[PDB]
Amino acid sequence: KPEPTDEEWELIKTVTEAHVATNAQGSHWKQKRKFLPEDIGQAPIKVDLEAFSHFTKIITPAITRVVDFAKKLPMFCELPCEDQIILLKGCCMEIMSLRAAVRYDPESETLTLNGEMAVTRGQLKNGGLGVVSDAIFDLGMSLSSFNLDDTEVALLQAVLLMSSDRPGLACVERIEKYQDSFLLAFEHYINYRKHHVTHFWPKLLMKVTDLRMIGACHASRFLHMKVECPTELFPPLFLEVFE
């Protein structure tokens, strides 16, 4: 099974450094994290306004970290500004959800958001995500045995970022080219890594689909939240994602 070429090790370094530099709290997240109190994010009688309020306050930095991740990839910097915007809108919630899912802790049954806020399945559900909370937690549980490292997480992020089917893109072929560069480097890294999980590469590709489904469904939850919540309750960066 082929291992990375020299050019692919160079890409692996670049992508991994970009992720590590932009992942909240880095290696100290578990020390930093504060458990959101249990009285926040309980089921109403719709949206628990206090949990919602907490989540809206941390969305802007989470999106901003994804922006910063992308800007550290020369391939992404080569794209026209309008393609950069469309790719960012498309992948932000996917990447943040991956970043939360890899911070699932079975001992507390929480994900950690923004490197500091540990939340339960119910809190994230009732704060606005609905079934998407379950999707992300499930994902997190299923990733525990995958033992993904920084590199593997970063490569999953780059694959999501370089998605040539986002609507309105101009550089569709160039963006597929970049994706396939990432995919090949990733498969070759996975081959080198020898995880003790059968059919690991096709299984990872199913996790990418799961993240794409999460991303799509955040839009759905936004529309549902806008029934109870005026748009001005959402931070303007989050509003831009969905316009």
Binding site: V67, K71, C81, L237, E240, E243
Partner: peptide, 11 residues
């Protein structure tokens, strides 16, 4: 639109 994203991307 996309004003703020465009700012964050560009600078």
């Amino acid at each position: 639109e996309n004003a703020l994203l465009r700012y964050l991307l560009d600078k």
